PDB file of all heavy atoms in Angstrom:
ATOM      1  N   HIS S   8      -0.853   5.374  -1.031  1.00 48.12           N
ATOM      2  CA  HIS S   8      -1.554   5.439  -2.310  1.00 48.12           C
ATOM      3  C   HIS S   8      -2.539   4.264  -2.445  1.00 48.12           C
ATOM      4  O   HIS S   8      -2.098   3.113  -2.627  1.00 48.12           O
ATOM      5  CB  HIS S   8      -0.518   5.535  -3.455  1.00 48.12           C
ATOM      6  CG  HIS S   8       0.519   4.455  -3.459  1.00 48.12           C
ATOM      7  ND1 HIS S   8       1.712   4.444  -2.718  1.00 48.12           N
ATOM      8  CD2 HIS S   8       0.466   3.284  -4.155  1.00 48.12           C
ATOM      9  CE1 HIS S   8       2.344   3.279  -2.967  1.00 48.12           C
ATOM     10  NE2 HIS S   8       1.605   2.543  -3.831  1.00 48.12           N
ATOM     11  N   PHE S   9      -3.818   4.535  -2.310  1.00 44.97           N
ATOM     12  CA  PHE S   9      -4.871   3.528  -2.474  1.00 44.97           C
ATOM     13  C   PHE S   9      -5.469   3.596  -3.886  1.00 44.97           C
ATOM     14  O   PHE S   9      -5.767   4.656  -4.422  1.00 44.97           O
ATOM     15  CB  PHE S   9      -6.007   3.769  -1.462  1.00 44.97           C
ATOM     16  CG  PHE S   9      -5.646   3.441  -0.001  1.00 44.97           C
ATOM     17  CD1 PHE S   9      -5.421   4.486   0.917  1.00 44.97           C
ATOM     18  CD2 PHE S   9      -5.545   2.107   0.402  1.00 44.97           C
ATOM     19  CE1 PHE S   9      -5.099   4.180   2.253  1.00 44.97           C
ATOM     20  CE2 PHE S   9      -5.228   1.806   1.721  1.00 44.97           C
ATOM     21  CZ  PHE S   9      -5.002   2.843   2.655  1.00 44.97           C
ATOM     22  N   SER S  10      -5.612   2.423  -4.542  1.00 44.23           N
ATOM     23  CA  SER S  10      -6.237   2.295  -5.871  1.00 44.23           C
ATOM     24  C   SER S  10      -7.720   2.717  -5.904  1.00 44.23           C
ATOM     25  O   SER S  10      -8.192   3.196  -6.926  1.00 44.23           O
ATOM     26  CB  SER S  10      -6.134   0.806  -6.331  1.00 44.23           C
ATOM     27  OG  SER S  10      -4.815   0.324  -6.246  1.00 44.23           O
ATOM     28  N   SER S  11      -8.410   2.607  -4.775  1.00 43.05           N
ATOM     29  CA  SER S  11      -9.803   3.026  -4.559  1.00 43.05           C
ATOM     30  C   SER S  11     -10.129   3.064  -3.070  1.00 43.05           C
ATOM     31  O   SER S  11      -9.609   2.267  -2.275  1.00 43.05           O
ATOM     32  CB  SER S  11     -10.753   2.054  -5.282  1.00 43.05           C
ATOM     33  OG  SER S  11     -12.124   2.349  -5.012  1.00 43.05           O
ATOM     34  N   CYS S  12     -11.095   3.899  -2.658  1.00 41.81           N
ATOM     35  CA  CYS S  12     -11.738   3.840  -1.347  1.00 41.81           C
ATOM     36  C   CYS S  12     -12.317   2.483  -0.954  1.00 41.81           C
ATOM     37  O   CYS S  12     -12.416   2.201   0.256  1.00 41.81           O
ATOM     38  CB  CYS S  12     -12.831   4.917  -1.219  1.00 41.81           C
ATOM     39  SG  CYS S  12     -12.248   6.567  -0.754  1.00 41.81           S
ATOM     40  N   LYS S  13     -12.647   1.602  -1.901  1.00 36.48           N
ATOM     41  CA  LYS S  13     -13.092   0.221  -1.629  1.00 36.48           C
ATOM     42  C   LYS S  13     -12.027  -0.581  -0.833  1.00 36.48           C
ATOM     43  O   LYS S  13     -12.358  -1.260   0.122  1.00 36.48           O
ATOM     44  CB  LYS S  13     -13.528  -0.456  -2.944  1.00 36.48           C
ATOM     45  CG  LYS S  13     -14.534  -1.619  -2.745  1.00 36.48           C
ATOM     46  CD  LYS S  13     -13.907  -3.003  -2.468  1.00 36.48           C
ATOM     47  CE  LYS S  13     -13.229  -3.659  -3.695  1.00 36.48           C
ATOM     48  NZ  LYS S  13     -14.232  -4.157  -4.659  1.00 36.48           N
ATOM     49  N   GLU S  14     -10.759  -0.429  -1.214  1.00 37.27           N
ATOM     50  CA  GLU S  14      -9.613  -1.044  -0.485  1.00 37.27           C
ATOM     51  C   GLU S  14      -9.360  -0.341   0.851  1.00 37.27           C
ATOM     52  O   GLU S  14      -9.021  -1.007   1.821  1.00 37.27           O
ATOM     53  CB  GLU S  14      -8.377  -0.957  -1.421  1.00 37.27           C
ATOM     54  CG  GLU S  14      -7.251  -1.920  -0.987  1.00 37.27           C
ATOM     55  CD  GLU S  14      -7.588  -3.389  -1.249  1.00 37.27           C
ATOM     56  OE1 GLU S  14      -7.393  -3.839  -2.412  1.00 37.27           O
ATOM     57  OE2 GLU S  14      -8.040  -4.093  -0.336  1.00 37.27           O
ATOM     58  N   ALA S  15      -9.544   0.991   0.927  1.00 37.63           N
ATOM     59  CA  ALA S  15      -9.437   1.723   2.182  1.00 37.63           C
ATOM     60  C   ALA S  15     -10.454   1.257   3.238  1.00 37.63           C
ATOM     61  O   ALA S  15     -10.084   0.937   4.370  1.00 37.63           O
ATOM     62  CB  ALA S  15      -9.561   3.217   1.820  1.00 37.63           C
ATOM     63  N   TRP S  16     -11.741   1.143   2.872  1.00 38.12           N
ATOM     64  CA  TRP S  16     -12.792   0.595   3.728  1.00 38.12           C
ATOM     65  C   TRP S  16     -12.554  -0.835   4.221  1.00 38.12           C
ATOM     66  O   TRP S  16     -12.876  -1.135   5.354  1.00 38.12           O
ATOM     67  CB  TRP S  16     -14.146   0.719   3.005  1.00 38.12           C
ATOM     68  CG  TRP S  16     -14.742   2.104   2.916  1.00 38.12           C
ATOM     69  CD1 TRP S  16     -14.735   3.032   3.910  1.00 38.12           C
ATOM     70  CD2 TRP S  16     -15.520   2.701   1.851  1.00 38.12           C
ATOM     71  NE1 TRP S  16     -15.439   4.140   3.533  1.00 38.12           N
ATOM     72  CE2 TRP S  16     -15.971   3.976   2.267  1.00 38.12           C
ATOM     73  CE3 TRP S  16     -15.876   2.291   0.531  1.00 38.12           C
ATOM     74  CZ2 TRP S  16     -16.802   4.776   1.495  1.00 38.12           C
ATOM     75  CZ3 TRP S  16     -16.681   3.121  -0.269  1.00 38.12           C
ATOM     76  CH2 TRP S  16     -17.152   4.349   0.190  1.00 38.12           C
ATOM     77  N   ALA S  17     -11.946  -1.681   3.400  1.00 35.65           N
ATOM     78  CA  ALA S  17     -11.531  -3.042   3.836  1.00 35.65           C
ATOM     79  C   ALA S  17     -10.470  -3.039   4.962  1.00 35.65           C
ATOM     80  O   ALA S  17     -10.343  -4.045   5.688  1.00 35.65           O
ATOM     81  CB  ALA S  17     -11.056  -3.809   2.594  1.00 35.65           C
ATOM     82  N   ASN S  18      -9.747  -1.921   5.134  1.00 35.38           N
ATOM     83  CA  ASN S  18      -8.810  -1.691   6.242  1.00 35.38           C
ATOM     84  C   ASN S  18      -9.401  -0.788   7.363  1.00 35.38           C
ATOM     85  O   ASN S  18      -8.670  -0.434   8.299  1.00 35.38           O
ATOM     86  CB  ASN S  18      -7.515  -1.076   5.633  1.00 35.38           C
ATOM     87  CG  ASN S  18      -6.755  -2.119   4.787  1.00 35.38           C
ATOM     88  OD1 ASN S  18      -5.930  -2.844   5.301  1.00 35.38           O
ATOM     89  ND2 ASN S  18      -6.986  -2.184   3.512  1.00 35.38           N
ATOM     90  N   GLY S  19     -10.651  -0.393   7.283  1.00 35.49           N
ATOM     91  CA  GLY S  19     -11.339   0.467   8.243  1.00 35.49           C
ATOM     92  C   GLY S  19     -11.075   1.963   8.070  1.00 35.49           C
ATOM     93  O   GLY S  19     -11.421   2.771   8.931  1.00 35.49           O
ATOM     94  N   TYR S  20     -10.458   2.399   6.941  1.00 35.52           N
ATOM     95  CA  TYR S  20     -10.167   3.811   6.642  1.00 35.52           C
ATOM     96  C   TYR S  20     -11.435   4.498   6.129  1.00 35.52           C
ATOM     97  O   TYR S  20     -11.815   4.403   4.957  1.00 35.52           O
ATOM     98  CB  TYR S  20      -9.016   3.918   5.658  1.00 35.52           C
ATOM     99  CG  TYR S  20      -7.574   3.682   6.108  1.00 35.52           C
ATOM    100  CD1 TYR S  20      -7.277   2.689   7.056  1.00 35.52           C
ATOM    101  CD2 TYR S  20      -6.552   4.453   5.544  1.00 35.52           C
ATOM    102  CE1 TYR S  20      -5.950   2.482   7.449  1.00 35.52           C
ATOM    103  CE2 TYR S  20      -5.202   4.217   5.905  1.00 35.52           C
ATOM    104  CZ  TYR S  20      -4.905   3.228   6.871  1.00 35.52           C
ATOM    105  OH  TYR S  20      -3.620   3.042   7.236  1.00 35.52           O
ATOM    106  N   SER S  21     -12.123   5.199   7.030  1.00 36.53           N
ATOM    107  CA  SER S  21     -13.340   5.984   6.776  1.00 36.53           C
ATOM    108  C   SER S  21     -13.316   7.336   7.514  1.00 36.53           C
ATOM    109  O   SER S  21     -12.548   7.498   8.476  1.00 36.53           O
ATOM    110  CB  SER S  21     -14.614   5.201   7.170  1.00 36.53           C
ATOM    111  OG  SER S  21     -14.557   4.845   8.545  1.00 36.53           O
ATOM    112  N   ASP S  22     -14.132   8.305   7.055  1.00 39.15           N
ATOM    113  CA  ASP S  22     -14.172   9.695   7.565  1.00 39.15           C
ATOM    114  C   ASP S  22     -12.773  10.337   7.708  1.00 39.15           C
ATOM    115  O   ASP S  22     -12.450  10.945   8.747  1.00 39.15           O
ATOM    116  CB  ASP S  22     -15.025   9.735   8.850  1.00 39.15           C
ATOM    117  CG  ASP S  22     -15.272  11.151   9.387  1.00 39.15           C
ATOM    118  OD1 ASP S  22     -15.477  12.099   8.591  1.00 39.15           O
ATOM    119  OD2 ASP S  22     -15.302  11.324  10.650  1.00 39.15           O
ATOM    120  N   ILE S  23     -11.910  10.140   6.717  1.00 38.78           N
ATOM    121  CA  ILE S  23     -10.529  10.666   6.697  1.00 38.78           C
ATOM    122  C   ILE S  23     -10.522  12.193   6.757  1.00 38.78           C
ATOM    123  O   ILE S  23     -11.180  12.862   5.911  1.00 38.78           O
ATOM    124  CB  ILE S  23      -9.781  10.119   5.451  1.00 38.78           C
ATOM    125  CG1 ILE S  23      -9.645   8.615   5.406  1.00 38.78           C
ATOM    126  CG2 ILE S  23      -8.427  10.802   5.321  1.00 38.78           C
ATOM    127  CD1 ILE S  23      -9.191   8.085   4.031  1.00 38.78           C
ATOM    128  N   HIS S  24      -9.846  12.760   7.750  1.00 38.40           N
ATOM    129  CA  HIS S  24      -9.640  14.220   7.940  1.00 38.40           C
ATOM    130  C   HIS S  24      -8.295  14.690   7.422  1.00 38.40           C
ATOM    131  O   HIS S  24      -7.427  13.869   7.017  1.00 38.40           O
ATOM    132  CB  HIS S  24      -9.791  14.519   9.461  1.00 38.40           C
ATOM    133  CG  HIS S  24     -11.190  14.467   9.988  1.00 38.40           C
ATOM    134  ND1 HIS S  24     -11.583  14.706  11.304  1.00 38.40           N
ATOM    135  CD2 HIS S  24     -12.376  14.244   9.285  1.00 38.40           C
ATOM    136  CE1 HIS S  24     -12.911  14.600  11.402  1.00 38.40           C
ATOM    137  NE2 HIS S  24     -13.428  14.318  10.188  1.00 38.40           N
ATOM    138  N   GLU S  25      -8.049  15.990   7.383  1.00 37.98           N
ATOM    139  CA  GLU S  25      -6.752  16.590   7.037  1.00 37.98           C
ATOM    140  C   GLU S  25      -5.569  15.974   7.804  1.00 37.98           C
ATOM    141  O   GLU S  25      -5.647  15.724   9.024  1.00 37.98           O
ATOM    142  CB  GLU S  25      -6.824  18.137   7.193  1.00 37.98           C
ATOM    143  CG  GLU S  25      -7.378  18.581   8.582  1.00 37.98           C
ATOM    144  CD  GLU S  25      -7.238  20.123   8.784  1.00 37.98           C
ATOM    145  OE1 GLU S  25      -7.554  20.902   7.853  1.00 37.98           O
ATOM    146  OE2 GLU S  25      -6.899  20.571   9.897  1.00 37.98           O
ATOM    147  N   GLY S  26      -4.479  15.675   7.102  1.00 36.76           N
ATOM    148  CA  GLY S  26      -3.263  15.031   7.663  1.00 36.76           C
ATOM    149  C   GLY S  26      -3.278  13.506   7.719  1.00 36.76           C
ATOM    150  O   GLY S  26      -2.228  12.937   7.934  1.00 36.76           O
ATOM    151  N   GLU S  27      -4.412  12.890   7.470  1.00 34.48           N
ATOM    152  CA  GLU S  27      -4.497  11.404   7.306  1.00 34.48           C
ATOM    153  C   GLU S  27      -4.350  11.011   5.811  1.00 34.48           C
ATOM    154  O   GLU S  27      -4.715  11.772   4.910  1.00 34.48           O
ATOM    155  CB  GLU S  27      -5.831  10.878   7.845  1.00 34.48           C
ATOM    156  CG  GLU S  27      -5.794  10.554   9.347  1.00 34.48           C
ATOM    157  CD  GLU S  27      -6.099   9.058   9.600  1.00 34.48           C
ATOM    158  OE1 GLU S  27      -7.297   8.647   9.549  1.00 34.48           O
ATOM    159  OE2 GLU S  27      -5.121   8.286   9.854  1.00 34.48           O
ATOM    160  N   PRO S  28      -3.852   9.788   5.542  1.00 32.77           N
ATOM    161  CA  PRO S  28      -3.645   9.307   4.178  1.00 32.77           C
ATOM    162  C   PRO S  28      -4.943   9.132   3.407  1.00 32.77           C
ATOM    163  O   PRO S  28      -5.860   8.435   3.850  1.00 32.77           O
ATOM    164  CB  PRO S  28      -2.897   7.968   4.331  1.00 32.77           C
ATOM    165  CG  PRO S  28      -3.372   7.486   5.712  1.00 32.77           C
ATOM    166  CD  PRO S  28      -3.463   8.772   6.495  1.00 32.77           C
ATOM    167  N   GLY S  29      -5.044   9.781   2.253  1.00 30.66           N
ATOM    168  CA  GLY S  29      -6.189   9.749   1.360  1.00 30.66           C
ATOM    169  C   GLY S  29      -7.068  10.992   1.368  1.00 30.66           C
ATOM    170  O   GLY S  29      -7.914  11.125   0.493  1.00 30.66           O
ATOM    171  N   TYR S  30      -6.815  11.938   2.269  1.00 26.28           N
ATOM    172  CA  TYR S  30      -7.530  13.244   2.294  1.00 26.28           C
ATOM    173  C   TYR S  30      -7.430  14.014   0.958  1.00 26.28           C
ATOM    174  O   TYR S  30      -8.306  14.824   0.618  1.00 26.28           O
ATOM    175  CB  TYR S  30      -6.937  14.052   3.444  1.00 26.28           C
ATOM    176  CG  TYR S  30      -7.345  15.513   3.482  1.00 26.28           C
ATOM    177  CD1 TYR S  30      -8.571  15.915   4.071  1.00 26.28           C
ATOM    178  CD2 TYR S  30      -6.511  16.505   2.904  1.00 26.28           C
ATOM    179  CE1 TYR S  30      -8.894  17.268   4.132  1.00 26.28           C
ATOM    180  CE2 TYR S  30      -6.836  17.878   2.957  1.00 26.28           C
ATOM    181  CZ  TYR S  30      -8.059  18.266   3.571  1.00 26.28           C
ATOM    182  OH  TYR S  30      -8.415  19.565   3.629  1.00 26.28           O
ATOM    183  N   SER S  31      -6.349  13.792   0.215  1.00 28.95           N
ATOM    184  CA  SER S  31      -6.040  14.451  -1.056  1.00 28.95           C
ATOM    185  C   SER S  31      -7.013  14.107  -2.172  1.00 28.95           C
ATOM    186  O   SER S  31      -7.680  13.068  -2.206  1.00 28.95           O
ATOM    187  CB  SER S  31      -4.623  14.086  -1.498  1.00 28.95           C
ATOM    188  OG  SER S  31      -4.050  15.117  -2.271  1.00 28.95           O
ATOM    189  N   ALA S  32      -7.063  14.968  -3.220  1.00 28.66           N
ATOM    190  CA  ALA S  32      -7.806  14.756  -4.450  1.00 28.66           C
ATOM    191  C   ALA S  32      -7.440  13.440  -5.204  1.00 28.66           C
ATOM    192  O   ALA S  32      -8.228  12.918  -5.991  1.00 28.66           O
ATOM    193  CB  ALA S  32      -7.569  15.964  -5.381  1.00 28.66           C
ATOM    194  N   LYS S  33      -6.232  12.883  -4.909  1.00 27.86           N
ATOM    195  CA  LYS S  33      -5.737  11.611  -5.411  1.00 27.86           C
ATOM    196  C   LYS S  33      -6.566  10.394  -5.000  1.00 27.86           C
ATOM    197  O   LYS S  33      -6.438   9.325  -5.611  1.00 27.86           O
ATOM    198  CB  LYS S  33      -4.252  11.444  -4.953  1.00 27.86           C
ATOM    199  CG  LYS S  33      -3.325  12.609  -5.357  1.00 27.86           C
ATOM    200  CD  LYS S  33      -3.171  12.810  -6.857  1.00 27.86           C
ATOM    201  CE  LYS S  33      -2.336  11.684  -7.490  1.00 27.86           C
ATOM    202  NZ  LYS S  33      -2.397  11.751  -8.995  1.00 27.86           N
ATOM    203  N   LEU S  34      -7.407  10.520  -3.962  1.00 31.23           N
ATOM    204  CA  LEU S  34      -8.316   9.485  -3.455  1.00 31.23           C
ATOM    205  C   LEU S  34      -9.792   9.860  -3.617  1.00 31.23           C
ATOM    206  O   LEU S  34     -10.584   9.045  -4.088  1.00 31.23           O
ATOM    207  CB  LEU S  34      -7.995   9.287  -1.962  1.00 31.23           C
ATOM    208  CG  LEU S  34      -7.424   7.922  -1.540  1.00 31.23           C
ATOM    209  CD1 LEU S  34      -8.345   6.751  -1.930  1.00 31.23           C
ATOM    210  CD2 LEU S  34      -6.035   7.741  -2.125  1.00 31.23           C
ATOM    211  N   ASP S  35     -10.140  11.093  -3.278  1.00 32.95           N
ATOM    212  CA  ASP S  35     -11.523  11.614  -3.286  1.00 32.95           C
ATOM    213  C   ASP S  35     -11.781  12.367  -4.595  1.00 32.95           C
ATOM    214  O   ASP S  35     -11.405  13.529  -4.740  1.00 32.95           O
ATOM    215  CB  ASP S  35     -11.730  12.451  -2.045  1.00 32.95           C
ATOM    216  CG  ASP S  35     -13.219  12.885  -1.905  1.00 32.95           C
ATOM    217  OD1 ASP S  35     -14.079  12.055  -1.529  1.00 32.95           O
ATOM    218  OD2 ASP S  35     -13.589  14.040  -2.161  1.00 32.95           O
ATOM    219  N   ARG S  36     -12.427  11.690  -5.561  1.00 34.86           N
ATOM    220  CA  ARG S  36     -12.709  12.217  -6.938  1.00 34.86           C
ATOM    221  C   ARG S  36     -13.406  13.577  -6.977  1.00 34.86           C
ATOM    222  O   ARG S  36     -13.147  14.381  -7.878  1.00 34.86           O
ATOM    223  CB  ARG S  36     -13.490  11.158  -7.748  1.00 34.86           C
ATOM    224  CG  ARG S  36     -14.939  10.899  -7.239  1.00 34.86           C
ATOM    225  CD  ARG S  36     -15.642   9.800  -7.997  1.00 34.86           C
ATOM    226  NE  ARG S  36     -15.126   8.444  -7.647  1.00 34.86           N
ATOM    227  CZ  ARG S  36     -15.608   7.296  -8.031  1.00 34.86           C
ATOM    228  NH1 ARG S  36     -16.639   7.188  -8.836  1.00 34.86           N
ATOM    229  NH2 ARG S  36     -15.084   6.192  -7.591  1.00 34.86           N
ATOM    230  N   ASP S  37     -14.273  13.836  -5.998  1.00 34.07           N
ATOM    231  CA  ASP S  37     -15.042  15.106  -5.812  1.00 34.07           C
ATOM    232  C   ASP S  37     -14.300  16.148  -4.967  1.00 34.07           C
ATOM    233  O   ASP S  37     -14.804  17.281  -4.844  1.00 34.07           O
ATOM    234  CB  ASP S  37     -16.409  14.703  -5.203  1.00 34.07           C
ATOM    235  CG  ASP S  37     -16.353  13.854  -3.936  1.00 34.07           C
ATOM    236  OD1 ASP S  37     -15.937  12.659  -3.978  1.00 34.07           O
ATOM    237  OD2 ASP S  37     -16.708  14.298  -2.824  1.00 34.07           O
ATOM    238  N   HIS S  38     -13.127  15.835  -4.465  1.00 33.72           N
ATOM    239  CA  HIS S  38     -12.253  16.617  -3.570  1.00 33.72           C
ATOM    240  C   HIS S  38     -12.973  17.616  -2.633  1.00 33.72           C
ATOM    241  O   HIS S  38     -12.738  18.798  -2.605  1.00 33.72           O
ATOM    242  CB  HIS S  38     -11.117  17.269  -4.376  1.00 33.72           C
ATOM    243  CG  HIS S  38     -10.006  17.910  -3.562  1.00 33.72           C
ATOM    244  ND1 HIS S  38      -9.430  17.386  -2.413  1.00 33.72           N
ATOM    245  CD2 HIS S  38      -9.413  19.111  -3.822  1.00 33.72           C
ATOM    246  CE1 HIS S  38      -8.504  18.245  -2.002  1.00 33.72           C
ATOM    247  NE2 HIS S  38      -8.453  19.302  -2.838  1.00 33.72           N
ATOM    248  N   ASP S  39     -13.899  17.071  -1.823  1.00 32.43           N
ATOM    249  CA  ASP S  39     -14.756  17.871  -0.900  1.00 32.43           C
ATOM    250  C   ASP S  39     -14.180  17.967   0.533  1.00 32.43           C
ATOM    251  O   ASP S  39     -14.914  18.276   1.474  1.00 32.43           O
ATOM    252  CB  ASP S  39     -16.213  17.366  -0.946  1.00 32.43           C
ATOM    253  CG  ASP S  39     -16.454  16.006  -0.278  1.00 32.43           C
ATOM    254  OD1 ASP S  39     -15.519  15.191  -0.078  1.00 32.43           O
ATOM    255  OD2 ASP S  39     -17.627  15.623  -0.134  1.00 32.43           O
ATOM    256  N   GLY S  40     -12.854  17.710   0.715  1.00 30.89           N
ATOM    257  CA  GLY S  40     -12.171  17.846   1.990  1.00 30.89           C
ATOM    258  C   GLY S  40     -12.435  16.695   3.012  1.00 30.89           C
ATOM    259  O   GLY S  40     -12.197  16.848   4.211  1.00 30.89           O
ATOM    260  N   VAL S  41     -12.939  15.553   2.508  1.00 31.80           N
ATOM    261  CA  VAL S  41     -13.173  14.315   3.230  1.00 31.80           C
ATOM    262  C   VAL S  41     -12.805  13.172   2.272  1.00 31.80           C
ATOM    263  O   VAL S  41     -12.971  13.324   1.057  1.00 31.80           O
ATOM    264  CB  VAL S  41     -14.636  14.170   3.700  1.00 31.80           C
ATOM    265  CG1 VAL S  41     -14.796  13.032   4.705  1.00 31.80           C
ATOM    266  CG2 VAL S  41     -15.205  15.440   4.316  1.00 31.80           C
ATOM    267  N   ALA S  42     -12.396  12.023   2.773  1.00 32.75           N
ATOM    268  CA  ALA S  42     -12.152  10.817   1.936  1.00 32.75           C
ATOM    269  C   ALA S  42     -12.748   9.554   2.555  1.00 32.75           C
ATOM    270  O   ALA S  42     -12.754   9.376   3.795  1.00 32.75           O
ATOM    271  CB  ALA S  42     -10.663  10.725   1.657  1.00 32.75           C
ATOM    272  N   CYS S  43     -13.275   8.674   1.678  1.00 37.10           N
ATOM    273  CA  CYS S  43     -13.985   7.452   2.010  1.00 37.10           C
ATOM    274  C   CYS S  43     -15.053   7.646   3.113  1.00 37.10           C
ATOM    275  O   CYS S  43     -15.108   6.919   4.102  1.00 37.10           O
ATOM    276  CB  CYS S  43     -12.944   6.313   2.268  1.00 37.10           C
ATOM    277  SG  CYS S  43     -11.503   6.289   1.139  1.00 37.10           S
ATOM    278  N   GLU S  44     -15.837   8.698   2.991  1.00 37.99           N
ATOM    279  CA  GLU S  44     -16.875   9.124   3.942  1.00 37.99           C
ATOM    280  C   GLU S  44     -17.961   8.045   4.174  1.00 37.99           C
ATOM    281  O   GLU S  44     -18.418   7.409   3.252  1.00 37.99           O
ATOM    282  CB  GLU S  44     -17.481  10.473   3.496  1.00 37.99           C
ATOM    283  CG  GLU S  44     -18.141  10.437   2.111  1.00 37.99           C
ATOM    284  CD  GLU S  44     -17.583  11.591   1.211  1.00 37.99           C
ATOM    285  OE1 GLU S  44     -18.088  12.708   1.214  1.00 37.99           O
ATOM    286  OE2 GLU S  44     -16.619  11.384   0.431  1.00 37.99           O
ATOM    287  N   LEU S  45     -18.340   7.892   5.444  1.00 38.22           N
ATOM    288  CA  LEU S  45     -19.277   6.817   5.876  1.00 38.22           C
ATOM    289  C   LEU S  45     -20.266   7.371   6.947  1.00 38.22           C
ATOM    290  O   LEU S  45     -20.626   6.757   7.934  1.00 38.22           O
ATOM    291  CB  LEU S  45     -18.446   5.612   6.334  1.00 38.22           C
ATOM    292  CG  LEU S  45     -19.107   4.226   6.082  1.00 38.22           C
ATOM    293  CD1 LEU S  45     -18.011   3.169   5.947  1.00 38.22           C
ATOM    294  CD2 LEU S  45     -20.055   3.776   7.178  1.00 38.22           C
ATOM    295  N   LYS S  46     -20.714   8.633   6.706  1.00 38.48           N
ATOM    296  CA  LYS S  46     -21.643   9.414   7.541  1.00 38.48           C
ATOM    297  C   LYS S  46     -23.080   9.203   7.073  1.00 38.48           C
ATOM    298  O   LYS S  46     -23.726  10.145   6.554  1.00 38.48           O
ATOM    299  CB  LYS S  46     -21.206  10.884   7.561  1.00 38.48           C
ATOM    300  CG  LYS S  46     -19.750  11.143   8.012  1.00 38.48           C
ATOM    301  CD  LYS S  46     -19.281  10.544   9.353  1.00 38.48           C
ATOM    302  CE  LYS S  46     -19.856  11.174  10.598  1.00 38.48           C
ATOM    303  NZ  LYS S  46     -21.192  10.673  10.987  1.00 38.48           N
ATOM    304  N   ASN S  47     -23.568   7.969   7.236  1.00 39.84           N
ATOM    305  CA  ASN S  47     -24.895   7.473   6.834  1.00 39.84           C
ATOM    306  C   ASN S  47     -25.176   7.673   5.310  1.00 39.84           C
ATOM    307  O   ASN S  47     -26.306   8.095   4.945  1.00 39.84           O
ATOM    308  CB  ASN S  47     -25.991   8.062   7.765  1.00 39.84           C
ATOM    309  CG  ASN S  47     -25.671   7.973   9.250  1.00 39.84           C
ATOM    310  OD1 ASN S  47     -25.212   8.914   9.868  1.00 39.84           O
ATOM    311  ND2 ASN S  47     -25.827   6.817   9.854  1.00 39.84           N
TER     312      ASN S  47
END
């Protein structure tokens, strides 16, 4: 459970896919099937 993607990125958690921690709507406010996305 991350308070924000800002804390996830400080640990290198980016481009989160299905089955990784934070993929859920609980992390990604727009729930578009990706979390803490960093694709330019």
Side-chain angles (χ1 to χ4, degrees):
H8 53 276
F9 290 107
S10 307
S11 175
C12 275
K13 204 274 287 286
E14 197 71 83
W16 285 320
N18 290 273
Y20 284 37
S21 59
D22 186 39
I23 298 167
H24 287 179
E25 50 173 43
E27 273 242 281
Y30 170 83
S31 208
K33 305 298 289 169
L34 245 302
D35 187 76
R36 68 184 73 174
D37 53 292
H38 191 42
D39 72 341
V41 193
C43 321
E44 59 233 272
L45 214 155
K46 306 306 288 84
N47 313 100

